[PDB]
Structure 1
Amino acid sequence: SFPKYKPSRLATLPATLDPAEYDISPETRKAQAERLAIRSRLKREYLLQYNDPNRLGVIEDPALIRWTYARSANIYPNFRPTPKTSLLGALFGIGPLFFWYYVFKTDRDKKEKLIQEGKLDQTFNISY
């Protein structure tokens, strides 16, 4: 009836436009109940320490520790040299260097050749 909205990576699909939430099953209801139970258990565990009058300091969060560890220390032990890894490493670690080397070498060779011929307009060029 109306023009259709299509989602993208940086502009996602709205919940009210999602087909999965319009055709539901008792299995889906059970899964939602389990999700809410997990969230409620975590919320109770946090709130018990949050309201503790004898608690002074920082309530340690295992999820934050897991996130930082995964982002920092768990990366190399889970690395394998593969065609994708090797190709991406070679590209993004070597290509820019040679690209910039070619650019700068060409520019400086042109400038040097111009200077040898004596046509660069270096008047008032005292500081370098």
Structure 2
Amino acid sequence: SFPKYKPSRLATLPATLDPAEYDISPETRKAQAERLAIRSRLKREYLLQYNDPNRLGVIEDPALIRWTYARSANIYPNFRPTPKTSLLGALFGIGPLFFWYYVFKTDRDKKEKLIQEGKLDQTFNISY
């Protein structure tokens, strides 16, 4: 035996260490066959449109269109005001603003108090 490899989100499990590939059953082989069949049908359609001498443009990709549409225009109709969504929206959209406001307000209050007290030493400060 040897020390174990532990996968993570950003360092995934290697293919050759998966228990899944070594559990072969007829349903698994059938699923692999159908996956290869789908990929081969798509490849045949693409190459048929690709090798055509009469085609003179972009081969339109429905998968890319679906990707861009889902990323951009399908978000709001599928939005639902949810405790998770509401809390994350409020946090990520308001908390930074108030955090930065507090920081800058404290900094400028300290600076203003110092300049009123005269102990700031602003010599040679001509450009603002």
TM-score (norm 2): 0.99
- The CA distance in 2 between the partners of 1:20 and 1:93, in whole Å, is 43
SS state of the match for residue 77, structure 2?
Answer: helix
Structure 2 counterpart of 1:87? 87
Q: Is 15-24 or 30-39 further displaced after alignment?
A: 15-24
- Cα offsets for 1:73-92 (capped at 9, x unmatched): 00000000000000000000
Q: What is the match of residue 39 of structure 2?
A: 39
Residue 71 of structure 1 aligns to a residue in which SS? Answer: helix
**1:22-70 deviations in Å (ceiling 9; x for gaps):** 1111100000000000000000000001000000010000000000000
Q: Distance in 2 between matches of 1:22 and 1:51?
A: 39
Separation (CA, whole Å) in 2 of partners of 1:70 and 1:23 = 35
Structure 1 position 108, deviation (Å): 0.1
Report how many aligned residue pairs link the two structures. Answer: 128
The CA distance in 2 between the partners of 1:23 and 1:70, in whole Å, is 35
Identity between Structure 1 and Structure 2 (%): 100
Cα distance in 2 for residues equivalent to 1:127 and 1:91? 38
**In structure 1, what is the Cα distance between the partners aligned to 2:121 and 2:37?**
78
Consecutive aligned runs of 4 or more in structure 1 exceeding 4 Å deviation = none
SS of residue matched to 2:121: coil
Q: Matches of 1:23 and 1:55 in 2, distance apart?
A: 45
Aligned-pair RMSD on alpha carbons?
A: 0.3
- In the superposition, the TM-score normalised over structure 1's length comes to 0.99
